Amino acid sequence: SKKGVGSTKNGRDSEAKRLGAKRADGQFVTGGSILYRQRGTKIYPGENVGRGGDDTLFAKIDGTVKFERFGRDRKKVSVYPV
Amino acid sequence: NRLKEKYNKEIAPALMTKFNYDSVMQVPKIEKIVINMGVGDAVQNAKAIDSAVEELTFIAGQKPVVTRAKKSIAGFRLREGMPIGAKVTLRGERMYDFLDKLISVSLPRVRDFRGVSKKSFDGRGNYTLGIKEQLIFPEIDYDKVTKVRGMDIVIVTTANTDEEARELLTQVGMPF
């Protein structure tokens, strides 16, 4: 016996895009290097960090990276020099 | 001009010693008068907006705003925009002039006039006149009237409770 029903309708899925931390806390980091790939602003730019057009957080200068917090319930990437 | 002097001289000592305020600034003042129009045929009558852009400029020379709908309603066949209703806000000298027009000249011409309602206060100290015939004060001119669309007047005091706005508006001259 094999009675026919088909049509899953749910095959497809998009390609995994690699959001999240690309560099860590206390990591030495050159200029222009992507610190955080995200959608929206799960984490904000702080000192010496810029937010991109695809709202990635990248470092503007050389220096270590710190994920501090924006006070209430909110985070922040900031790059400091040595 | 005359209603300001009436208000100050007669009303402010009388109302101040009637409600026993702890300062001269607690005495309620009529701050603003908002004239709603509420023409909802802008959807169905595309010209009709000029009606009460024509009329409310003559009702008070401050031109009303052609105000827009802020939310789409499917039962009324209406998307966000397609502007609905006119609106005058009023503070200055023309407003005591406008209550001078209402109290002494207009409100006789309500063709079925009685005590306009005691129960038209919100519970905070503000009042609205619900008008059904748009010609009450003599400027409106039956000659220039086809659409009968009435009016909502919102007399807004600075009163903190309600019955002292009652005793304000009775003493200004609104009958009830």
């Binding site: - | 009558n45 595309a46 010209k47 066949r77």
Partner: protein
């Protein structure tokens, strides 16, 4: 010169030879008297497209 009598209560609808009687730069929306809803459609816009 003489006498031209016509009915006072007759509604004479006139058509001209010359096309110089338009309230120009107006929309046909504002031109044609379309009162409410189907007055655009059932009266007017059907009458145009049809």
């Amino acid at each position: 010169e003489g006498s031209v009598w016509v009915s006072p209560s007759a509604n004479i609808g006139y058509l001209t030879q010359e096309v110089f009687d338009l309230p120009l730069e107006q929309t046909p929306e504002e031109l044609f008297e379309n009162e409410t809803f189907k007055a655009r459609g059932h009266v007017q816009n059907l009458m145009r497209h049809l």
